[PDB]
Design a binder for this molecule. Structure first.
Ligand code: G2P
Ligand code: G2P
Ligand code: G2P
Ligand code: G2P
Ligand code: MG
Ligand code: MG
Lengths: 378, 379
């Protein structure tokens, strides 16, 4: 089981196998549709709050040109925010949003510094140094991106935020911006702790549900289908077979003389071979809508879909030969040097239930097992 | 079913478990969060040390020596507080004490963040690191192992102090800057609350899943009592323990008689229905200490007994046989009575004797009870 082995060996440093990671990314994108809706809404609200704050804070009568330039930049992203808005709600193109989400964030960061880079252009001192911080925290919003995607994005944002102040506004406020950029560095580090626990929990919650579902779908010792799933699926198979008007053939597999194997070879060794029986039974089960299941204990049942009586006899004979050709020693057998297998085949028609076919299948094995080696009766 | 499975099916939006589950979860949270306190103490010591360096970096000691001294006293005070709480957090013996002051420790850190600022306006010097108050809020969201609502209510209280101190002790010269920064900090809390919710929700589902996955796989059964493989581990351990203290172990196998009639006349859902009442009445009849009851597979089950004599084993076998006989279930196809009949086989084990020998004797008596018209118990 690919899911089980990933959980056992651990997934530290937050990385799956190539196929599992691709499945996880689809899982991440599927469950982050609601988060994208909130992220677009909050970004529109935040930038709207920036505009009203700027107008009510800076005087226009003395610096009208500065106000006009700032107002153009802010509305520019707001209009650009309404053009990426149709690309985040339509499910038809949600895939492209996985690659443009970094584009839609770093561009927002670009405008955050653009508003400040104009206060010193017009010779007006700043009134809030917390603008740069809110652009950085937008990176950590849960847009369904991975751990390393968000982390590498904020670090790039941090570098660009530091760069804009070094080449601009020189010999003025340099100490206060460098400290604020340094303070932001701690902001990124603190948020990295929390995001790590989020992504680690998310992956191992995804791994659990896949493993839990598979475990209930199959049995444990072998890879066949457990009892309660087999009953439900066979009823669906019978209903489907009646819908398309074609008979369903049932063949049951039973091991003969298992006390001798148990008491002479040991309890763990006696059925250690059960997996070997499972694989050689499964390799003979490759047809479409052809199932392999264990009914609990020594006896197994496999269901054939759209097969004729000649085919059922042919496939039953070769699997009996195949298990005989395995040649596992079993000294207590009265029908051969090695362990022997009994088969019982029954045919089911449309509108005829599971109970009747099982009744029509059991005594063929009973008449075969007794006074018989590996005989098969229809 | 399981309490863990019950919660998962019910759902846990708003992040609240049952009282017993939440107490287990909180202990689970504290156990796994022990490593996080190592980093939390490290960063808080490092951050406050860096605050001291920054304050001395530019503050004019010549012009304002009193301001520098007062700030230096406050910052070293919490570092002293960090060195007195540090021995109370790394010791596993009082880990409950270590997180008994976690809201207390964070609030004090927030207090010094504002106290090392308001003194700038006390001495008439404009501040230079308005971002300082924000760092006192982000400390609340550090993964200290607290619950979701504990962190959320803590940061909101820290938000209140920022607004209160700047409106009252913040004078009137830099107010318009203060409310803007406090309003921006409100967005900081809101943004971090989104990520916090996903963290706690993802964590809680795992604990329900891990408890459910482990218990269903290793232990228990879908309808029965215990998995066959786990029964084998217990039986080997019980035999090893029994041989160590030199006492016999009694084994009893319970079998259903004439099950073909029940299956083909009453149906499969009736057949598995007969199983689960059979399981519960066998479970209620198994109350001895270190008593193992399991579903081996198919129709037969085995119960393991520790420190019992032949008379007790025969006595308990008879009453459960009468109990299941007293249970009125229509099994009209029976050839041994009006209702379904149950066969039992009891075997005794000695010291240093393998499970195959006792199992062979146990089933041997079972068939010799079967051919005797059922309803028989043999040793
Ligand atoms: N059982 C749990 N283990 C957890 C939980 N959170 C973290 N961990 C542990 O985190 C481990 C991840 O590997 P590391 O120790 O390298 C992770 P790091 O040291 O960077 O941070 P922690 O996750 O705080 O240990 C993993 O072995 C888990 O046992 C949790 O909620 N439950
Ligand atoms: N290790 C395991 N042993 C099993 C399992 N299921 C059944 N058994 C063992 O197999 C036996 C039950 O099957 P039967 O007694 O009907 C075996 P036998 O081949 O003699 O039956 P017929 O061929 O129908 O006469 C019994 O010894 C069980 O302990 C299993 O999943 N694992
Ligand atoms: N299968 C997953 N569901 C998730 C994940 N993250 C969030 N959710 C969903 O979160 C939901 C729990 O919250 P509610 O249903 O009350 C809606 P709320 O807005 O509070 O949460 P979200 O649905 O996460 O926005 C739940 O239905 C999940 O489907 C995830 O990683 N996997
Ligand atoms: N509904 C279920 N039927 C089961 C289950 N396990 C076995 N069986 C049925 O039990 C039958 C196997 O034969 P049994 O060992 O029950 C023999 P029975 O008690 O009918 O006759 P005696 O040998 O005279 O005691 C067969 O019809 C199986 O389908 C199970 O978990 N559920
Ligand atoms: Mg058999
Ligand atoms: Mg029987």
């Amino acid at each position: 089981n690919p899911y089980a082995r990933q959980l056992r060996n651990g997934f530290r440093w937050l990385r799956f196998e190539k196929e599992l990671e691709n499945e996880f990314r689809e899982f991440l994108s599927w469950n982050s549709l609601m988060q994208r809706r909130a992220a677009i809404g909050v970004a529109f609200l935040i930038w709207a709050l920036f505009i009203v704050a700027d107008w009510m804070m800076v005087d226009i009568r003395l610096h009208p040109s500065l106000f006009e330039q700032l107002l153009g930049v802010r509305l520019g992203m707001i209009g650009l925010l309404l053009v990426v808005w149709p690309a985040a709600f339509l499910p038809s193109l949600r895939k492209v949003g996985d690659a443009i989400a970094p584009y839609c964030l770093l561009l927002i960061n670009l405008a955050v510094l653009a508003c400040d880079v104009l206060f010193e252009w017009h010779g007006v001192p700043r009134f809030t140094q917390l603008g740069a911080t809110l652009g950085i925290l937008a990176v950590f919003f849960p847009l369904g991106l991975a751990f390393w995607a968000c982390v590498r994005l904020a670090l790039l944002c941090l570098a660009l935020n530091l760069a804009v102040f070094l080449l601009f506004g020189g010999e003025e406020n340099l100490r206060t911006n460098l400290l604020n950029t340094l303070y932001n560095g701690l902001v990124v580090l603190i948020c990295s702790f929390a995001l790590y626990l989020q992504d680690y929990a998310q992956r191992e919650q995804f791994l659990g549900r896949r493993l839990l579902g598979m475990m209930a779908e199959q049995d444990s010792l072998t890879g066949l289908v457990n009892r309660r799933y087999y009953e439900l699926l066979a009823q669906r198979a019978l209903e489907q077979g009646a819908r398309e008007e074609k008979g369903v053939a049932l063949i049951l597999v039973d091991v003969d003389d298992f006390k001798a194997y148990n008491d002479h070879y040991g309890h763990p060794a006696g059925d250690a071979a059960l997996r070997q029986l499972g694989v050689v039974l499964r390799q003979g089960a490759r047809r479409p809508l052809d199932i392999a299941a264990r009914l609990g204990g020594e006896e197994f049942a496999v269901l054939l879909y759209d097969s004729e009586e000649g085919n059922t006899l042919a496939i039953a004979e070769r699997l009996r030969q195949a298990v005989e050709a395995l040649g596992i020693e079993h000294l207590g057998s009265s029908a051969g040097p090695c362990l022997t297998i009994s088969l019982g085949v029954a045919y089911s028609t449309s509108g005829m239930g599971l109970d009747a076919l099982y009744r029509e299948a059991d005594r063929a094995l009973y008449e075969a097992k007794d006074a018989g080696r590996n005989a098969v009766r229809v």
